[model samples]
Target: PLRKLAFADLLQATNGFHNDSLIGSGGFGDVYKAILKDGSAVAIKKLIHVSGQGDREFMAEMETIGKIKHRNLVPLLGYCKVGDERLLVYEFMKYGSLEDVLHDPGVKLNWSTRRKIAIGSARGLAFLHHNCSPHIIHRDMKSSNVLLDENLEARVSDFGMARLMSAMDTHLSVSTLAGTPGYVPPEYYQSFRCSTKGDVYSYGVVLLELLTGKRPTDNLVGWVKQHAKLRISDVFDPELMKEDPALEIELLQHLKVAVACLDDRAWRRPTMVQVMAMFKEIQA
Candidate 1:
């Protein structure tokens, strides 16, 4: 059961929401690392204010995500609500997000570790797409949303921009444009609709990141496609290519999954479950 913590408790844990405790900031608001009196650590997300009408929707979404429990997902520990301000608590990830580790040369992620991240993150997304009630669509799916623990196990985090699919609808209309650039599917621009397939497209980009170690900001998808068609080996992250037969074979196999997930046609893209199976086969 999720706790409904007092706003006062959060204020103290975050040391009055001090800048020093700030771990991350996003469209929702700032994320601070807080340690409770019991010595339990958590990441607190303070959302920006929303009007009364939309506030109900926010609460409903929070409840939906709170009930979610998965090994590959960052658990929603509790929440606090005081008028327009909203606070969410989650188990603290020791190794920070996938983006932090993937982009930072100071920390090297070996091939086996990267493989674990890709498969675990895919499992998390697949769970949201197929296992959850109301079927949550993670409007944003990027490396930042993929958190890592002390064992380097990947956990999908951040649901500040989630949209739930109703029993009758296959896709939800996106009234507002949201999602990190390059990761978003092309159809989203033309249709303004969000679906689980859109999530797959973003997940594809993240997979490519694991393969290439390139940020989406650098036209990564297109770059991968260009070089990949000619020579798949050309696009691999040099760090992963360091003298190993099984590693090279696995890298090549993973590239095919990324290509399939990044398909231009939404219908053509493999579902996350399918992607998971593909990864499983490669590992086996």
Candidate 2:
């Protein structure tokens, strides 16, 4: 059975959902930090009232995430439905989203930490792609949706646009698109839809983020155009290039995986399961 709490109780706990309590925002809604009556912390995602796709997205998340559980996946604690408003309660992640730590100037994530994130997030996504009964597709896979716990372990979140692929079906076409701009696969522009490969493309972008510490759409054409024949080490993250001698080899290996996954031909991209194996090798 689902847990329930009065709207007023949530309001009081979060200080009327104060702006200071705000941790992150997404297409579905804004996420706030809340302390429960028992003194345990939790994340409360309040759906944006005027969001055109709010209700449908909320229902999809509830139906999918409510039945799934894994160490690498954020747990859905409970939900609130008041009038037309919808809210989801989740265990509070101490370190917050990966985007904050990775992109923020003041925060410096070491190679070890970044490796853990890469492997852990890959495991989570692999589970969704292969282990689930219907095979879930995290349509909006990006740095922002990957949450971090107190120990900085990665957990995938934000399933508002997740699609449950039929086990018997080979593929599905998406009439309307979803996902972050830079993360979306290039093939999506041609087909105007999604597939298992689409998710792989997004995961490849995340891999690129880990390797180069640069966003996926960070002038790919220009970067390639200028540095086409340069040593791969020259184009990798400066920090990575400096200290770790093995960094260049690792970056090139990962870069190959990223390129293969991002291949314009969807069928040529590796599946999420194959990606998990690649990350495991990197970990070993």
Candidate 3:
């Protein structure tokens, strides 16, 4: 599904996966930022200690995702491998993950950018959850996995823990779970599966992160549900508040959608359809 390339060429591009060339790392592997022979920037997810069935599964998923293309989804450009040192190449997302910019003191994101991120990230995940043929559940749906391109467009990244299934109406119970403990859906403890509902719930937490400049999961969840009387300034990131003290109803309405997505009852939570609609509504 990808333009499988010379493994040696990539090694030369990354200087043998040197630390300075690395862009990221996670359950999948260490990702290195590389400039190809063509002088194009790309991200290379290099497998660490990968072998046998795991290697087989990783390639299978990489091939599958490489075929699935959407502007909102991170594009798998190519791959290279020799023995266990497998690598998945992707288009470099210049702005990095939403996690960094959201929490960084130096990066001052205006309301419009944040709003774009909110909608764009939602659209990305919405495409993954509802649009695909088999439908993919990104077990690791979090701010860290939502990467930003040069234009600040959000692209859903890190599909290492993703599960592909044709679960149309019912939930598919898989044997593994690999998401942030906090983002796991409420129903997860009882009986968890790779469900779009769960992904929606987790993405909701990301929304909360964007709305409030808070880190971690509980703060935004609890903060939004309680204290209706708190001033509008209280709900947003203080820096965003300082941008303009005056808040629009549509702005805080995003929080309401966040709260709804995190609903305890899976059915009660709005689907990606409704979530994207709400985001589009706000956008319009």
Candidate 4:
């Protein structure tokens, strides 16, 4: 249940969305860190005029993300619409996106932390796929869309690109594909369409990121395809790979799940629900 806020209050709280307070920039908007009069911090996403999608997309996100209540999903605090301008307010994730820590050389994420992130992210996407009334497909499921809290707990965000499937439809047809390269499924290139499997493929790429600490464009997938080897210990971050054998076994099990999800045949990929169950089993 997200509340509607006045644009004036948001302006005052964010100091007219000052550039100095900006925390992140996305395809749809700029996210700024703001503190209310009561000293509560919030992240305000102000849509850019150049962004193609307008009120329709904003309203769609509000309707979808607002109703979704899961531990691994970012909570919508409120929203504001002033004439042509629209904005969304969400609980601020202190650590920001997963890309910050994984890609930053200064930040060292241990194996346990990385595993937790992978599991948490899987749960989030699983919820969107299985729990929602009309299953939501996060069209842009990338590391950048995964926000982290103080404890490094990951939460999925950015629902503007999400597609809601109807009960009658088993798949979604799209005139054009919309997703980050390297993470996009092969079927998307062949059919120029989307489905639950597309989301699963993207999640597999994110899991790969957690294991290898490498970008999707780093040729790791190409190497895997060429070798036909999906052993987690073999593909893991070299430094972490050498440290613990027990952890390596656990990572291998998870890697199997990721590889299964990345199958070229869309129907062969596991559903998000199945993936979530596998994660819970690993956690146990």
List the lowest-lDDT window of 10 residues for candidate 3: 52-61
Judged by whole-model lDDT over C-alpha atoms, candidate 1 comes out at: 0.85
Q: Per-residue lDDT for 157-181 in model 4, tens only?
A: 9887788887567788765677888
Number of backbone-clashing residue pairs for each candidate, in the order shown: 0, 0, 0, 0
- Return the TM-score for each candidate structure: 0.94, 0.92, 0.91, 0.92
lDDT, each prediction: 0.85, 0.79, 0.78, 0.82
Top model number, TM-score: 1
Q: Candidate 3 — which residues are off by over 4 angstroms?
A: 52-57, 217-219, 228-232
Residue-level lDDT of model 3, residues 1-284, one tens digit each, is 47887998898999987999987676566889989999979998887657653585465558457769888888898987777677888999988888888777455678888888888878877787778868787767788888889898888887766777684644778775557866878777777575888888998898888878777555567677674466755777777766775655666888889888989888888988898898777767
Better of 1 and 4 by TM-score: 1
Ranking by lDDT: 1, 4, 2, 3
Q: Which ten residues in a row have the lowest lDDT in candidate 1?
A: 52-61
Candidate 2 lands at a TM-score of: 0.92
Tell me how candidate 3 scores on lDDT: 0.78
lDDT of 1 by residue, 77-187 (tens): 888878777788889999898888888745679888998999999999999888887888987899998999879999998776787887567788877766899898988
